[PDB]
Write an enzyme that holds these catalytic residues in place. Structure first.
Site, PDB file in Angstrom:
ATOM      1  N   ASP A  97      -8.418  -4.474  19.475  1.00  0.00           N
ATOM      2  CA  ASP A  97      -8.483  -3.562  18.425  1.00  0.00           C
ATOM      3  C   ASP A  97      -9.553  -3.871  17.422  1.00  0.00           C
ATOM      4  O   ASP A  97      -9.241  -3.634  15.935  1.00  0.00           O
ATOM      5  CB  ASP A  97      -6.973  -2.512  18.240  1.00  0.00           C
ATOM      6  CG  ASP A  97      -7.390  -1.497  17.301  1.00  0.00           C
ATOM      7  OD1 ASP A  97      -8.572  -0.948  17.024  1.00  0.00           O
ATOM      8  OD2 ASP A  97      -6.777  -1.018  16.929  1.00  0.00           O
ATOM      9  N   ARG A 123     -10.606  -2.698   9.483  1.00  0.00           N
ATOM     10  CA  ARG A 123      -9.606  -1.868   9.511  1.00  0.00           C
ATOM     11  C   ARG A 123      -8.712  -3.297   9.737  1.00  0.00           C
ATOM     12  O   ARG A 123      -7.997  -2.555   9.373  1.00  0.00           O
ATOM     13  CB  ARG A 123      -9.656  -0.471   9.794  1.00  0.00           C
ATOM     14  CG  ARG A 123      -9.297  -0.723  11.399  1.00  0.00           C
ATOM     15  CD  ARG A 123      -8.905   1.091  12.144  1.00  0.00           C
ATOM     16  NE  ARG A 123      -9.489   0.447  13.450  1.00  0.00           N
ATOM     17  CZ  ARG A 123     -10.304   0.962  14.152  1.00  0.00           C
ATOM     18  NH1 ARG A 123     -10.620   1.010  13.428  1.00  0.00           N
ATOM     19  NH2 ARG A 123     -10.772   0.751  15.384  1.00  0.00           N
ATOM     20  N   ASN A 124      -8.889  -3.805  10.688  1.00  0.00           N
ATOM     21  CA  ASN A 124      -8.197  -4.841  11.217  1.00  0.00           C
ATOM     22  C   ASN A 124      -8.196  -6.315  10.788  1.00  0.00           C
ATOM     23  O   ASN A 124      -7.645  -7.283  10.953  1.00  0.00           O
ATOM     24  CB  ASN A 124      -7.531  -4.499  13.102  1.00  0.00           C
ATOM     25  CG  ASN A 124      -6.351  -3.983  13.093  1.00  0.00           C
ATOM     26  OD1 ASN A 124      -5.563  -3.369  12.795  1.00  0.00           O
ATOM     27  ND2 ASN A 124      -6.413  -3.683  14.397  1.00  0.00           N
ATOM     28  N   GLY A 150       0.160  -1.170  -0.293  1.00  0.00           N
ATOM     29  CA  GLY A 150       0.309  -0.393  -0.080  1.00  0.00           C
ATOM     30  C   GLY A 150       0.492   1.382  -0.119  1.00  0.00           C
ATOM     31  O   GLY A 150       0.832   2.591   0.376  1.00  0.00           O
ATOM     32  N   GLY A 151       2.056   1.161   0.012  1.00  0.00           N
ATOM     33  CA  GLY A 151       2.521   2.145  -0.154  1.00  0.00           C
ATOM     34  C   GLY A 151       2.901   3.114   0.642  1.00  0.00           C
ATOM     35  O   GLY A 151       3.420   4.240   0.971  1.00  0.00           O
ATOM     36  N   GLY A 152       2.620   2.299   1.990  1.00  0.00           N
ATOM     37  CA  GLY A 152       3.365   3.333   3.338  1.00  0.00           C
ATOM     38  C   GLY A 152       1.699   3.815   4.158  1.00  0.00           C
ATOM     39  O   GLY A 152       2.177   3.316   5.419  1.00  0.00           O
ATOM     40  N   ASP A 177      -3.953  -8.000  12.943  1.00  0.00           N
ATOM     41  CA  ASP A 177      -3.506  -6.390  14.454  1.00  0.00           C
ATOM     42  C   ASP A 177      -2.338  -5.785  13.982  1.00  0.00           C
ATOM     43  O   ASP A 177      -1.461  -6.628  13.847  1.00  0.00           O
ATOM     44  CB  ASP A 177      -4.061  -7.055  15.792  1.00  0.00           C
ATOM     45  CG  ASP A 177      -3.233  -5.463  16.933  1.00  0.00           C
ATOM     46  OD1 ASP A 177      -3.439  -4.758  16.053  1.00  0.00           O
ATOM     47  OD2 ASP A 177      -3.054  -6.090  17.585  1.00  0.00           O
TER      48      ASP A 177
HETATM   49  C1  LIG Z   1       3.238  -8.502   8.467  1.00  0.00           C
HETATM   50  C2  LIG Z   1       2.609  -9.177   9.248  1.00  0.00           C
HETATM   51  C3  LIG Z   1       3.139  -9.022  10.235  1.00  0.00           C
HETATM   52  C4  LIG Z   1       2.226  -8.750  11.604  1.00  0.00           C
HETATM   53  C5  LIG Z   1       1.033  -8.943  12.033  1.00  0.00           C
HETATM   54  N1  LIG Z   1       0.325  -9.190  13.351  1.00  0.00           N
HETATM   55  C6  LIG Z   1      -1.162  -9.598  13.141  1.00  0.00           C
HETATM   56  O1  LIG Z   1      -1.894  -9.407  11.950  1.00  0.00           O
HETATM   57  C7  LIG Z   1      -1.566  -9.989  14.866  1.00  0.00           C
HETATM   58  C8  LIG Z   1      -2.980 -10.534  15.269  1.00  0.00           C
HETATM   59  C9  LIG Z   1      -2.999 -10.899  15.404  1.00  0.00           C
HETATM   60  C10 LIG Z   1      -2.189 -10.204  17.474  1.00  0.00           C
HETATM   61  C11 LIG Z   1      -2.279 -11.130  18.855  1.00  0.00           C
HETATM   62  N2  LIG Z   1      -2.040 -10.116  19.983  1.00  0.00           N
HETATM   63  C12 LIG Z   1      -2.893 -11.259  20.704  1.00  0.00           C
HETATM   64  C13 LIG Z   1      -2.970  -9.755  22.395  1.00  0.00           C
HETATM   65  N3  LIG Z   1      -3.480  -8.096  21.567  1.00  0.00           N
HETATM   66  C14 LIG Z   1      -3.122  -7.563  22.279  1.00  0.00           C
HETATM   67  C15 LIG Z   1      -2.322  -7.627  20.275  1.00  0.00           C
HETATM   68  C16 LIG Z   1      -3.240  -9.000  18.834  1.00  0.00           C
HETATM   69  C17 LIG Z   1      -0.775  -9.978  17.067  1.00  0.00           C
HETATM   70  C18 LIG Z   1      -0.379  -9.526  15.721  1.00  0.00           C
HETATM   71  C19 LIG Z   1       0.527  -9.136  10.077  1.00  0.00           C
HETATM   72  C20 LIG Z   1       1.029  -9.514   9.336  1.00  0.00           C
HETATM   73  N4  LIG Z   1       0.997  -9.022   8.208  1.00  0.00           N
HETATM   74  C21 LIG Z   1      -0.035  -7.735   7.865  1.00  0.00           C
HETATM   75  N5  LIG Z   1       0.718  -5.985   8.537  1.00  0.00           N
HETATM   76  C22 LIG Z   1       0.047  -5.498   7.685  1.00  0.00           C
HETATM   77  C23 LIG Z   1      -0.390  -5.453   5.960  1.00  0.00           C
HETATM   78  C24 LIG Z   1      -0.750  -6.962   5.679  1.00  0.00           C
HETATM   79  C25 LIG Z   1      -1.424  -6.950   4.601  1.00  0.00           C
HETATM   80  C26 LIG Z   1      -2.084  -5.675   3.675  1.00  0.00           C
HETATM   81  C27 LIG Z   1      -2.744  -6.516   2.431  1.00  0.00           C
HETATM   82  C28 LIG Z   1      -3.289  -7.629   1.924  1.00  0.00           C
HETATM   83  N6  LIG Z   1      -2.879  -8.516   2.942  1.00  0.00           N
HETATM   84  C29 LIG Z   1      -1.844  -8.582   3.426  1.00  0.00           C
HETATM   85  N7  LIG Z   1       0.278  -8.025   6.160  1.00  0.00           N
END
Ligand SMILES: Cc1ccc(NC(=O)c2ccc(CN3CCN(C)CC3)cc2)cc1Nc1nccc(-c2cccnc2)n1
Ligand SMILES: O=C(NC1=NN(c2ccc(Cl)c(Cl)c2)C[C@@H]1CCO)c1ccncc1
Length: 264
Positions: free
Chosen positions: A127, A131-132, A18-20, A145
């Site tokens: 959260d 959007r998440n 998404g460019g940032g 998240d």
């Molecule tokens: C690259 C990456 C690194 C880490 C994460 N982490 C999480 O998504 C996540 C989910 C759940 C938890 C669980 N946690 C439990 C405790 N509480 C307090 C917080 C949540 C933690 C991290 C996601 C990603 N993936 C990600 N991140 C941003 C954008 C995208 C993306 C965007 C568009 C299309 N496909 C993927 N994908």
């Protein structure tokens, strides 16, 4: 270096995703499987903590960790990539004749399954919102998240209790006493259900942030949105019980949706 460590040369790094839009997250390719992936990079304690949590989470409707690179900087956390991006923009842009009532039901059912899993594993999201969430082919939905409170501009997150809160998704006891629990996730899930029913409208539309806590404490709740099935709105209202202990569990919510889904 544990089971999740992967060689940096296994990944082709492309542009910022998404460019940032997501900060230091890049679109990549897991070359050996011809798979697009998402790669979060460290531009330290908190970074590795997130990776450790994700190593414990494995569910079809949660974002899946694929590997980490931690031998030299920059550190990587690698996950699957979801074709259609985040659910809020997906809802706002979708063809509504394709994304009909049974599809919206299916998406709510999947999100409640992910949350039932986090509930069973004694995690708290903190959260939950459209959007998440991410959307894939064949109406797959995964809960994620993205750590958006530090990234997003606008009034989605605003200063409160010395942090940044998405006020209109935040349970009353979280707003008032900074108390978070799986039951405050249940409250946010009800708001998420409303986002789904409106194809991504902003909640409490037209109501200033300054009024939200007072209105909720005086038992105001969003009315059933246009076209929302009455049984789905019943579940929304149960998620918005003032007392956290009066809110259903995600196990109960998923059971309700599963029943609704197989009767459709
Ligand atoms: C690259 C990456 C690194 C880490 C994460 N982490 C999480 O998504 C996540 C989910 C759940 C938890 C669980 N946690 C439990 C405790 N509480 C307090 C917080 C949540 C933690 C991290 C996601 C990603 N993936 C990600 N991140 C941003 C954008 C995208 C993306 C965007 C568009 C299309 N496909 C993927 N994908
Ligand atoms: O009808 C509108 N929304 C709708 N919500 N429904 C629904 C179904 C299951 C769940 Cl689980 C949720 Cl949350 C919601 C179905 C219906 C759309 C399908 O006909 C609508 C009207 C006008 N503007 C925006 C939206």
């Amino acid at each position: 270096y544990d089971k999740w460590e992967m060689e940096r040369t296994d990944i082709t790094m492309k542009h910022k995703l998404g460019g940032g839009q997501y900060g230091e997250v890049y679109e990549g390719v897991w070359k050996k499987y011809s798979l697009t992936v998402a790669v979060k990079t460290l531009k330290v304690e908190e970074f590795l903590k997130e990776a450790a949590v994700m190593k414990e989470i494995k569910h079809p409707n949660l974002v899946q960790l694929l590997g980490v690179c931690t031998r030299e900087p920059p550190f990587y956390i690698i996950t699957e990539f979801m074709t259609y991006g985040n659910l809020l923009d997906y809802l706002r842009e979708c063809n509504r004749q394709e994304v009909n009532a049974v599809v919206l039901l299916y998406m709510a059912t999947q999100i409640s399954s992910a949350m039932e899993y986090l509930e069973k594993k004694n995690f708290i999201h903190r959260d939950l919102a459209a959007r998440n969430c991410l959307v894939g082919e064949n109406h797959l939905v995964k809960v994620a998240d993205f750590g958006l409170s530090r990234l997003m501009t606008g009034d989605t997150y605003t200063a409160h209790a010395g942090a940044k809160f998405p006020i209109k998704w935040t349970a009353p006891e979280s707003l008032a006493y900074n108390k978070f629990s799986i039951k405050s996730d249940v409250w946010a899930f009800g708001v998420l259900l409303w986002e789904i029913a409106t194809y991504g409208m902003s909640p409490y539309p037209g109501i200033d942030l300054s009024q939200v806590y007072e209105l909720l404490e005086k038992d105001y709740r969003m009315e059933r949105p246009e076209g929302c099935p009455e049984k789905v709105y019943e579940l929304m209202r149960a998620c918005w019980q003032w007392n956290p202990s009066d809110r259903p569990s995600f196990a109960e919510i998923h059971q309700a949706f599963e029943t609704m889904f197989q009767e459709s």
